[PDB]
Design a protein around this ligand. Structure first.
Ligand SMILES: NC(=O)c1ccc[n+]([C@@H]2O[C@H](COP(=O)([O-])OP(=O)(O)OC[C@H]3O[C@@H](n4cnc5c(N)ncnc54)[C@H](OP(=O)(O)O)[C@@H]3O)[C@@H](O)[C@H]2O)c1
Ligand SMILES: CCc1nc(N)nc(N)c1OCCCOc1ccccc1C[C@H](C(=O)O)C(F)F
Length: 171
């Protein structure tokens, strides 16, 4: 059955957006092990003007100078009663965080897994870098058969890596 690209203001659309290596790695040692300008631009194009929800460790991985990310309501998930995020809201659950009509979950590994049962869209960048999975890595969620996907062709980044975009939807 079909979904619409229009977001009625009384609904709670939840999407996830992440960049991964072909192995599924999204993070290691509290950082993202690549930077692709095309991915950075794409991330801002999708999320700008909406609420973004992130795990506390993803907030930590943002340089202090740049957070909160501008042009978006920044919401941070933490179970620690004394964690604070200057300029942003800290909430203790996904239920508290998903109050906007359109919310983009922007990481990390734990929060993607937490948010997936409520999500109806995923926007994925795949980077053609040979990074094998190591213990402790943050990993992308795996999408079951209820998701229908559009896979873009391989493109070439100014930074010299191949990459491609996926768009997934479900009802
Ligand atoms: N490639 C990408 O697209 C991408 C995007 C974003 C981040 N990343 C990377 O991914 C890594 C971070 O991912 P991660 O999995 O380690 O952590 P995370 O998902 O970003 O954040 C984990 C934290 O979220 C909080 N949390 C988790 N479940 C919760 C729940 N049910 N209710 C409330 N709070 C909850 C906890 O904070 P407390 O411990 O404070 O309770 C937990 O420690 C970093 O390397 C980052 O750079 C990659
Ligand atoms: C761009 C990576 C990415 N890509 C997709 N496709 N989805 C995501 N969720 C995603 O992580 C967004 C959150 C992590 O952002 C940072 C991590 C460390 C340092 C700086 C930033 C800010 C970014 C930057 O300037 O690199 C800015 F562009 F947002």
């Amino acid at each position: 059955h079909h979904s619409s690209g229009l977001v009625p203001r009384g609904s709670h659309m939840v999407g996830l957006i992440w960049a991964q290596a072909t192995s599924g790695v999204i993070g290691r040692g509290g950082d993202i092990p690549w930077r692709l300008p095309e991915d950075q631009a794409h991330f801002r194009e999708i999320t700008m003007g909406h609420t973004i929800v992130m795990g506390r460790r993803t907030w930590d991985s943002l340089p202090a100078k740049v957070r909160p990310l501008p042009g978006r309501r920044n919401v941070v998930l933490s179970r620690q009663a004394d964690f604070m995020a200057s300029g942003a809201e800290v909430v203790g659950s996904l239920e508290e965080a998903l109050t906007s009509p359109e919310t983009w979950v922007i990481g990390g590994g734990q929060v993607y897994a937490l948010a997936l049962p409520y999500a109806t869209r995923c926007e994925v960048t795949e980077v053609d870098i040979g990074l094998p999975r190591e213990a402790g890595d943050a990993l992308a969620p795996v999408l079951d058969e209820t998701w229908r996907g559009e896979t873009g062709e391989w493109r070439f980044s100014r930074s010299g890596l191949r990459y491609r975009l996926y768009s997934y939807h479900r009802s």
